[PDB]
Structure formats: structure tokens, C-alpha cells
């Protein structure tokens, strides 16, 4: 359980992401696909992308980054009371996409890496710790739902 102070550190940096969610999403995808190439294989729609240049030039990938981060943002804004938001997300990711918790850890790492790079003014050690805590809560709750849905994760 995160404290209000921790949630505020999370929401304060997210406020910066929201200045340009599309751009932040592109950086996050590039970081993820480069650090853990196996994650790209889960996207039938994007697995053909061979380079960072192609990834950057993909309008659909850019659009999906907006979809992904907006969904994550809505979850963060609930400050732990995200039961309703996690239901559809866990169902599609467990049954259709088949995304292991390990891959959610990879994207969490990418998100943190990008915020650390772009936002040193709002992503110091305490802020990063709060974001990690928020993402761990997210993955913990997703894992619990995965279990209820029949997916090992
Ligand atoms: C911060 C964590 C994540 C969030 C909030 C998130 C969110 C979303 C949302 C909202 C959609 C569209 C609706 C749906 O199908 O549920 C989506 C689709 C998808 N996600 Fe996730 N996702 C996350 C992480 C991942 C990761 C790490 C992978 C893969 C390694 C992944 C793979 C997919 C795939 C394959 C789709 C379908 C893309 C398409 O339209 O072709 N997601 N995700
Ligand atoms: O912070 C680094 C550790 O990250 C992972 O573990 C956290 O998140 C898991 C959920 O994805 C939890 O099960 C675990 O309890 C958390 O500490 C990773 O699995 C660990 O190996 C890393 O040390």
C-alpha cells in the first residue's frame, strides 16, 4: 500500500508525461524492444519492425503507445483503487496476448528508464521509488487476477 506522498510523487512525474504521451510512448517501446527483443514477438502487428528507425516511424506503434500509457495513467490516478480497470486488462493479457509477469517487469523497467532520462527534475530517488512501488502494486494485482483467470503468467 502506497502512502499519499508516494502517490503524489507518481502523479507529479506523470503530469510531465502527459505533456506529450505519444513521444514518451515511443521512447518506452524503443527502450523495451531493444533491452528485451523477445517482447516484440508478442505483437503480431509490430513484430516485423527491424530497427529503431522503423519503430520511430510507425504511426500505429505510436498510437498503441498512447493507448498503453493512457490505460496505465488511468490506473495510477486511481491510487490503488484500480479493480475495475484491471479486470479487462488482465483478461486480454492473460487469455489473448499471453503476457507473462516477467514481461510486465520489463516494460516497468523501460518506463522507469525513460522517466529517469527525460525527467530528472521530477524523478529523483524518492520519486523513482514511489513509481516502482506503484508499478509493483500493479503487477502484483495483475498476477492475482491472472491466477483467477487460469493463466500462469
Ligand atoms: C504497463 C503495462 C501495460 C499496459 C497498461 C497495457 C495496456 C494495453 C492496452 C490498453 C491494450 C489495448 C486493449 C487490450 O487489448 O487490452 C493493450 C494491447 C496489447 N498489449 Fe498491452 N499493456 C501493457 C503491457 C504489455 C506488454 C509488456 C506487452 C508485450 C510484451 C503487451 C502486449 C500487448 C499486445 C500484444 C496487445 C495488442 C496490440 C495490438 O492491438 O495489436 N502489453 N495493452
Ligand atoms: O525490484 C526488483 C525485483 O523486481 C521484481 O520483483 C518485484 O515484482 C514482482 C512482481 O513483478 C514481485 O513478485 C516481487 O515480490 C517484487 O519484489 C523481480 O521479480 C525481482 O527478481 C527483482 O529483484
UniProtKB/Swiss-Prot annotation:
One example GO MF annotation: oxygen carrier activity
GO terms of biological process kind: removal of superoxide radicals
Alphabetically ordered keywords of this record: Cytoplasm, Heme, Iron, Metal-binding, Muscle protein, Oxidoreductase, Oxygen transport, Phosphoprotein, Transport
EC assignment: 1.7.-.-, 1.11.1.-
GO (cellular component) term, any one: sarcoplasm
Designated name of the protein: Myoglobin
Family per record: Belongs to the globin family.
Statement: the UniProt record of this protein carries the keyword Heme: yes
Catalytic activity annotation: Fe(III)-heme b-[protein] + nitric oxide + H2O = Fe(II)-heme b-[protein] + nitrite + 2 H(+); H2O2 + AH2 = A + 2 H2O
Biological classification of the source: Eukaryota, Metazoa, Chordata, Craniata, Vertebrata
Modified residues (Phosphothreonine): 67
Residues holding O2: 64
Function according to Swiss-Prot or TrEMBL: Monomeric heme protein which primary function is to store oxygen and facilitate its diffusion within muscle tissues. Reversibly binds oxygen through a pentacoordinated heme iron and enables its timely and efficient release as needed during periods of heightened demand. Depending on the oxidative conditions of tissues and cells, and in addition to its ability to bind oxygen, it also has a nitrite reductase activity whereby it regulates the production of bioactive nitric oxide.
Location in or out of the cell: Cytoplasm, Sarcoplasm
Broad class of where this protein is predominantly found: cytoplasm
Complexes and interactors: Monomeric.
Gene3D superfamilies reported for this sequence: 6.10.140.2100, 6.10.140.2110
